Amino acid sequence: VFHKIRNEDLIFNESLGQGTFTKIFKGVRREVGDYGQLHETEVLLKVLDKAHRNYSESFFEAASMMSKLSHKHLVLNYGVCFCGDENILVQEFVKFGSLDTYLKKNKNCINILWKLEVAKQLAWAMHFLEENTLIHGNVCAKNILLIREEDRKTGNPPFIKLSDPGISITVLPKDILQERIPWVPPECIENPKNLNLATDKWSFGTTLWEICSGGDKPLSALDSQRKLQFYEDRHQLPAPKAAELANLINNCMDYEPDHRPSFRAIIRDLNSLF
Ligand SMILES: Nc1ncnc2c1ncn2[C@@H]1O[C@H](COP(=O)(O)OP(=O)(O)OP(=O)(O)O)[C@@H](O)[C@H]1O
Ligand SMILES: [Mg+2]
Numbered sequence: 001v002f003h004k005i006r007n008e009d010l011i012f013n014e015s016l017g018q019g020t021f022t023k024i025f026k027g028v029r030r031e032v033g034d035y036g037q038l039h040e041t042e043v044l045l046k047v048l049d050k051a052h053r054n055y056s057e058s059f060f061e062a063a064s065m066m067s068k069l070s071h072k073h074l075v076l077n078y079g080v081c082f083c084g085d086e087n088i089l090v091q092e093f094v095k096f097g098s099l100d101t102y103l104k105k106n107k108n109c110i111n112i113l114w115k116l117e118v119a120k121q122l123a124w125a126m127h128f129l130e131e132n133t134l135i136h137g138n139v140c141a142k143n144i145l146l147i148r149e150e151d152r153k154t155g156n157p158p159f160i161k162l163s164d165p166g167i168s169i170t171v172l173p174k175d176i177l178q179e180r181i182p183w184v185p186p187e188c189i190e191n192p193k194n195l196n197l198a199t200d201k202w203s204f205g206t207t208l209w210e211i212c213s214g215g216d217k218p219l220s221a222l223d224s225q226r227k228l229q230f231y232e233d234r235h236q237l238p239a240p241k242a243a244e245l246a247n248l249i250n251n252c253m254d255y256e257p258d259h260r261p262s263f264r265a266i267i268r269d270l271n272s273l274f
Contacts, residue, residue, distance in 0.1 A: 003079035104215025198257035205252030
C-alpha cells in the first residue's frame with residue numbers, strides 16, 4: 001500500500017494539462033523527511049475524479065504494482081492522497097519533463113549516440129518488468145521522463161525514467177484505445193483481453209520510432225477509422241529519415257505477438273549498433 005499523504009500538506013500550482021482521464025499539476029508537498037527535518041518538496045500531482053471509481057481503482061492499482069518494484073529507471077511515487085475531493089497520486093517532479101516534447105524542442109541537436117543511450121535505458125527498464133512479468137501497457141515517448149540532460153563537457157549521457165502505467169487498456173473505452181494506435185498493438189485492438197507482455201514489445205517499437213522522428217507522432221495524419229484500417233491491412237510504420245533503428249522498430253512491431261523479441265535480445269541488438 002502507498003504511504004498516505006494529508007490533503008493539508010499538498011499545494012496545487014500550475015496545470016500541466018490533462019492525460020487519460022487525469023488532470024496533471026505541479027505542486028509542493030510539506031513533509032517530515034529524514035532526521036525529522038521539515039521539507040517543502042516539488043511534486044507532480046496526478047488527479048483522478050472519485051466519481052470514476054473503476055478508472056481510479058485501475059489507475060492506482062497499476063501505479064502500486066509497479067511502485068513495489070524499485071528501479072533506477074522507474075518513476076518514484078511518494079504516495080497517494082484520497083482524503084479530499086479527489087484521488088491524487090503524488091509523484092517525483094522530473095526536471096526536464098517528457099521525452100516527446102524534448103525531442104521536438106531539441107531535434108536539431110539530438111544525435112544517434114543520445115538516441116541509443118535513451119533506447120538502451122528504456123530497454124533495461126522493460127527487461128526488468130519482463131523479468132517481473134509486469135505489463136506496463138502505456139509505453140510511449142510522452143511517458144519517458146528526462147531526469148538529466150546529456151552533458152558532453154563531462155561525459156554524462158542523458159538519464160530517463162518510465163512513468164506509471166495509468167488506467168489499464170482492459171478498462172479504457174474502445175474509443176481511447178483506437179486513438180492510441182499505433183502504440184496499442186493490433187491484438188489489443190481486436191480484444192483488449194489479449195493484453196500480454198508481448199504488448200510492451202510492440203509499443204517499445206513505436207516509442208523507438210518516436211525517438212528517431214523528432215517528436216512526430218506516428219499516424220497522426222490518420223483519423224481513428226483509418227488507424228483501425230491500418231492494422232486491418234497489416235501496415236507497418238515508415239522508416240524514420242534517421243534509419244539506424246528501422247530494423248529494430250519493425251522487428252518489435254511484429255503482427256505476431258509470439259515472434260516479438262525479448263528485451264534481452266533487444267538490448268544485445270542495441271549494444272551491437274555501436
Ligand atoms: N513525473 C513528471 N514530472 C514532470 N512532468 C510530468 C511528469 N509526469 C507527467 N508530466 C507532464 O505532465 C503532462 C501530462 O502528462 P501525461 O499526458 O502523461 O498525463 P498522464 O496522466 O500520465 O496520461 P497518460 O496515461 O495518457 O500518460 C506532460 O506535459 C508531461 O510532460
Ligand atoms: Mg503519462
